[PDB]
Every structure is written in C-alpha cells, then in structure tokens.
Design a protein around this ligand. Structure first.
Ligand SMILES: Nc1ncnc2c1ncn2[C@@H]1O[C@H](COP(=O)(O)OP(=O)(O)O)[C@@H](O)[C@H]1O
Ligand SMILES: Nc1ncnc2c1ncn2[C@@H]1O[C@H](COP(=O)(O)OP(=O)(O)O)[C@@H](O)[C@H]1O
Ligand SMILES: Nc1ncnc2c1ncn2[C@@H]1O[C@H](COP(=O)(O)OP(=O)(O)O)[C@@H](O)[C@H]1O
Ligand SMILES: [Mg+2]
Ligand SMILES: [Mg+2]
Ligand SMILES: [Mg+2]
Lengths: 246, 143, 103, 49, 52
C-alpha cells in the first residue's frame, strides 16, 4: 500500500484517493493568485481540526499577522489555534546582513507535536542567489530531513517564467506535483487544478475546476452519474388531466 | 546608497500628514535577483511599519507581470491593466491577479480613460402591477 | 428470409426519442440470455436498475437474467472519460465476460 | 474581514468589495499606455478630495 | 532633458525586432507619446496600420 493523509478538501481527496502522500513531500506549483498559500493553510488547519494532526507553517516572505488575517477573513479561526499551542508560524528572511532551519523546526515540532509542515517560498533562498551550484543538494537536503522526521510536507513554489517550476529541478525532486491554474477564456476567469504526477497511486489525470470562496478551497466532487435512485411511486404534476394522461 | 530615499520619503510623508503613498518608475531606480528582491522587501516593510497604504507602479513589456519577472511576487495586492486591439478596435481591461485576505472580481473588466477618468460598469427587480397604453387602442385592448 | 440476423454481425436500430430502440435491444439481450448465451448491455444514458424496471412494463424480467449471471450491465456517461478510455473500458469488460450479444 | 481604502473608482470599488488593501503594497502592472500612473494618481486625488 | 529645457519638440525614431515587440522596451517608458507603425500582410495584400 501507499501512505496517505487527507487535506480535508472534499473532492481533492477523491482525486488523490486519500490525500497527499503521508510523510512525503509534495509541490503545489502555481503562478500568483492561484491559491497555493490558501491550499497549504487549508492543509494544516483542517489537518489539526479533523484529523488531529499538528503542524508548523514556515514562511519565507510574509509576516505571521498577514498569514492570520488572510486565512481568518475566510473563516478559519487560526488565531485561537495559534494561542492553543497546537500550531506555529515561523518567519525567516534573506540577505540578513543549513542547521538553523533544522533547529527552529525541531523547536516548533516539539512545541506543537507536529506531523505536518508547510514551506512557503523556499524559493527565496535559492532564487535570491543562484551562485552556489549545490542548490538541488540543499533542496534534497531539507527534503530528506523532513522525510527522516516522518513529516508530511506541502512545499509551495513559483511558476512565472514558465514550465512547472522556475527552479527546473523541484518538480523532479517532489513526489506529488499539483499544478494550479486560473485562466481567462472570453473575459471570464476559471480556476483549475491538476495532479501532474503522483508516485505509487492512481490520481485524477485531468483538469478539475476548483473555486476559492468563503467556504474555502472547494472542488466540485467527482462520478455522480448512473448511480440513480429508482422509485416506483408517482409524482403529481398539479395538472390532473396531464397526470391521468399516463 | 539607499538611505537618501527614506530621508526624502519621511519629510514628505509628515509634511502633508498623509496616509496614502504612491511610487512610480521604481523599476528605473532598481535598474541578479538578490539586490532587487531584498531592497523591494525592505522598502515595503518600512512602509508597512509607518502604516502607509502603498500603490507601486509596475511595467511589464517583456514579461507577463514585470520587466524583471520576480518583482511582482513580493507584493500583497496585484492588479493588471491591459490594452488589447483585436480586429482594429482597442479596449482597455483590468483584472485582479491576487488580492490576499478578501474576495474580488476574478473576471476581466473593461474600463475607459475618458476626460472624466477611470470608468467601469459593474439580478432582479420588483414588478409593477399597473398597465400602460401603447397609443394603439385596439392593441392595448387586445389584452 | 433466413429467420434472423447473422450470428456475428452488426445491427443498427435507428429512431427518434421514445421509439422503442432500447426496448428492442433489451429484447435481443433477453432472448440471448434465455438461449443460455452471455449478454452485455452498455447504457450510456440510463441506469441498470432504471432500465430493467422500465422493461418490466414490457414483460421482460431483465433483472432475473442479471441475477443469474448471463447479463452484464455497464452504465456510464460520455463526458466522464475520453473516447479512448470509453473504447478501452468497453473492450476490457467484453473480454472479461466473453459475451455472445452486446447492446 | 480586512480594511479597505476606497479608490473612488466606482465599479472598481464594488469589484474589490470596497477598495485596495489598507496599509499594504499594491502593484499596478501593465505595458505602456495601460493607465497605471493615472490609476495611482486617481487613488491619491480621490483619497484627498 | 536638455531638449525639454530648450523647448524643442523632438520626434525620436526607433526600430523593433529580435524577438521582442521593441528593440529595448525601456525607451517606451522614457517617451511621453508612443506611436507604433506596422506593415502587416493579410492573404497576399498588405496594409499600413498606425496606433498610439
Ligand atoms: N475570502 C476570500 N474569498 C475568496 N477568495 C479569496 C479570499 N481570500 C483570498 N482569496 C483568494 O486567494 C488568492 C490568493 O491566494 P494566495 O495563495 O495567498 O496567493 P498566491 O496564489 O499568490 O500564493 C486570490 O486570488 C484570492 O481570490
Ligand atoms: N406497456 C406499454 N404500452 C405502450 N407503450 C409503452 C409501454 N411500455 C413502454 N412504452 C413506450 O415505450 C417507449 C420507451 O421505449 P425505449 O426503449 O425507452 O425507447 P428509447 O430508449 O429509444 O427512447 C416510451 O415512449 C413508452 O411510452
Ligand atoms: N487628459 C487625458 N485624457 C484622456 N486620456 C488620458 C488623459 N491623461 C492620461 N490619459 C490616458 O491614461 C494613460 C496614462 O498613461 P501613463 O500612466 O503615462 O502610462 P504608464 O504610467 O503606464 O507608463 C495614457 O495611455 C492616456 O491615454
Ligand atoms: Mg501567498
Ligand atoms: Mg434510447
Ligand atoms: Mg507615465
């Protein structure tokens, strides 16, 4: 079998047949506005709520207050969970003037009993400077550290220049790759997702449309067809003549 | 040097006692991702600290969102403007790529830059229960 | 003339809505199942219980043969899969059932 | 929710559900002639008037 | 800026090509009035299009 861990997303859990791979890294590729950060927020928060799985949210760009506001305006009561000592936000920076990440992660993990982890814009470190030729080594380094810790990972990424990833190697270092899209046909925007790759399980190999509402990141469940209910009773039409006609 | 920018900024901010800030042609000031990315985030952090509502101009001749391609991702709100010219007529359109923390209109929307300025046009009604005359007597009596 | 279409052949049953096409097809299938042959019914717009019950009105106990095992009813919808996937699934189920008649 | 600063641009305000995000960085992307500088100028002038 | 100080209406002519809609693209942002001309072929007949 293959390990699984639901995201709490109805429909997406059907596509993946259990959710993202438990204890394995996954990459949510997407341009700006697709909803990668919201997908990861849902991942962690719903994991805590429904599946009693604590987690840690490492942000490489924005502030914890910004994260809290963004996810709270929807309805996710993240401030309460933060002060409940069941979830944690960790802020990291670039251009300040390897083991630091591990140690801060260890502190947060032992503080909140974490089994889930989100890395928002690990890009920063690698993209700010491409001078070191061991970028893939650092990537797989953190990946192997989390895999050793047995932590499920949801790495966000950036896809502006093209391809599935700006780095070019992350898509091939991740096991489960989820591409998010937000295209504009005519003058109307449609949000879509696709399971580009999943190692060791059957997944939804096609574009499933999704929506971002107050309810959250929602996928129309998939396949709701030819499972009809067969009733032998008759329904009245309000027109007795028509009714009598049959 | 980067301190002169803040030096000039604070005087103007506090002189008119303003809360709205607009920055223009910052791409030219920027003129190798590290330098650019870092200074972008630094300035935005300082403006946030001062509590200033900031609107920054961005131009994207070469790329889909910015000239360099990495400036856009640092911002919290994104709005793209376009001028297409299918056939021969030209139309100006606006869209919100990203607006974290709220719901907005993902669809594109047409706007006009007339002498008045920006203009955009954004499902039921109550029904009246009185009749009207068509001016044609037989037609208005047909019902 | 010979009293029936050839064994290994293709029959087309053109018609409009509410013409009896599905009913004649179910009749072919029921006659096969009664003869003892294996039959498969691929409904691309109708459920199994639904169609079998609809055929009760014509004195056809399709459900009897389905319970016996000489009838396999595959209910699907076009827009779910690609045309290639539909073809492959149809051929798969046919190869697994070894049918004599297929609707 | 979150705070909004109206841009004074009707239609746009309704689409943004009020206005731009208050005290935050907002980008006006587009090629030449799209109207970015004028959009920001109207932001300021409407906020003032 | 020398020209602007001297009060001279200047028409600067530039070219495009090389895989980009303009040679550099950063001269557009310098200008105040950009006028694009095009020689485009439909079927087997070409037309001359001006845009601001
Ligand atoms: N309350 C909300 N209702 C609907 N959509 C929202 C809400 N809050 C945020 N969004 C959506 O989230 C998207 C951006 O999400 P996020 O992943 O944080 O940014 P990015 O996609 O750039 O990483 C926006 O396009 C916006 O439509
Ligand atoms: N006992 C009956 N008497 C008269 N007509 C019937 C009877 N049972 C079914 N029908 C008719 O048969 C038609 C259904 O046939 P069907 O095989 O569903 O055709 P199709 O599937 O091609 O539309 C309906 O129009 C229905 O009125
Ligand atoms: N008085 C006016 N009347 C009509 N249109 C105007 C007026 N002033 C500006 N515009 C329009 O607004 C746009 C502003 O362009 P500008 O902001 O200088 O470009 P950018 O800031 O994108 O480099 C122009 O394309 C112009 O057509
Ligand atoms: Mg984000
Ligand atoms: Mg039919
Ligand atoms: Mg300008």
């Amino acid at each position: 079998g293959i390990g699984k861990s639901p995201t709490g997303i109805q429909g997406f859990d059907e596509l993946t047949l259990g959710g993202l791979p438990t204890g394995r890294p996954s990459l949510v590729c997407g341009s700006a506005g697709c909803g990668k950060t919201l997908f990861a927020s849902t991942f962690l928060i719903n994991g805590v709520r429904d599946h009693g799985e604590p987690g840690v949210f490492v942000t490489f760009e924005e502030r914890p207050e910004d994260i809290v506001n963004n996810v709270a305006s929807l309805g996710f009561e993240l401030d309460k969970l933060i002060e409940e000592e069941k979830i944690a936000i960790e802020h990291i920076a670039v251009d300040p003037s390897l083991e630091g990440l591990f140690l801060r992660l260890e502190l947060a993990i032992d503080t909140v009993g974490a089994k889930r982890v989100v890395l928002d814009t690990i890009e920063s470190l690698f993209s700010a400077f491409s001078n070191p030729a061991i970028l893939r080594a650092e990537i797989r380094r953190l990946f192997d550290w989390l895999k050793e810790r047995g932590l499920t990972t949801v790495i966000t990424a950036e896809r502006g220049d093209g391809a599935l990833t700006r780095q070019g190697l992350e898509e091939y270092v991740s096991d489960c790759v989820i591409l998010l899209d937000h295209r504009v046909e005519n003058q109307i925007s449609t949000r879509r997702l696709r399971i580009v790759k999943y190692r060791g399980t059957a997944h939804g190999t096609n574009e499933y449309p999704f929506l971002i509402d107050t309810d959250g990141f929602s996928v129309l469940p998939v396949a709701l067809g030819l499972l009809h209910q067969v009733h032998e009773e008759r329904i009245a039409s309000g027109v007795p003549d028509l009714d009598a006609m049959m | 040097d980067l301190e002169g920018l803040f030096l000039r900024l604070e005087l103007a901010i506090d002189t008119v006692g303003a809360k709205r800030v607009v920055l223009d042609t910052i791409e030219s000031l920027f003129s190798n991702p590290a330098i650019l990315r870092a200074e972008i985030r630094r300035l935005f952090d300082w403006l946030k600290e001062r509590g200033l509502t900031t609107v920054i101009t961005a131009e994207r001749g070469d790329g889909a969102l910015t000239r360099q391609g990495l400036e856009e991702y640092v911002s919290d709100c994104v709005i793209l403007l376009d001028h297409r010219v299918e056939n021969q007529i030209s139309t100006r359109r606006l869209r919100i790529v990203k607006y974290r923390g709220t719901a907005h209109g993902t669809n594109e929307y047409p706007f006009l830059i007339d002498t008045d300025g920006f203009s955009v046009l954004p499902l039921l009604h109550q029904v009246h229960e009185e009749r009207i005359a068509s001016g044609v007597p037989d037609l208005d009596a047909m019902m | 003339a010979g009293g029936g279409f050839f064994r290994g052949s293709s029959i087309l049953v053109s018609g409009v809505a509410g013409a009896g096409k599905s009913s004649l097809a179910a009749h072919f299938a029921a006659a096969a199942c009664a003869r003892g042959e294996r039959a498969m019914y691929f409904s691309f717009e109708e459920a199994a219980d639904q169609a079998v019950r609809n055929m009760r009105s014509l004195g056809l106990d399709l459900g009897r043969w389905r319970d016996a095992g000489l009838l396999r009813f595959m209910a699907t919808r076009p827009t779910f899969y690609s045309l290639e996937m539909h073809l492959a699934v149809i051929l798969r189920e046919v190869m697994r059932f070894e049918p004599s008649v297929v609707v």
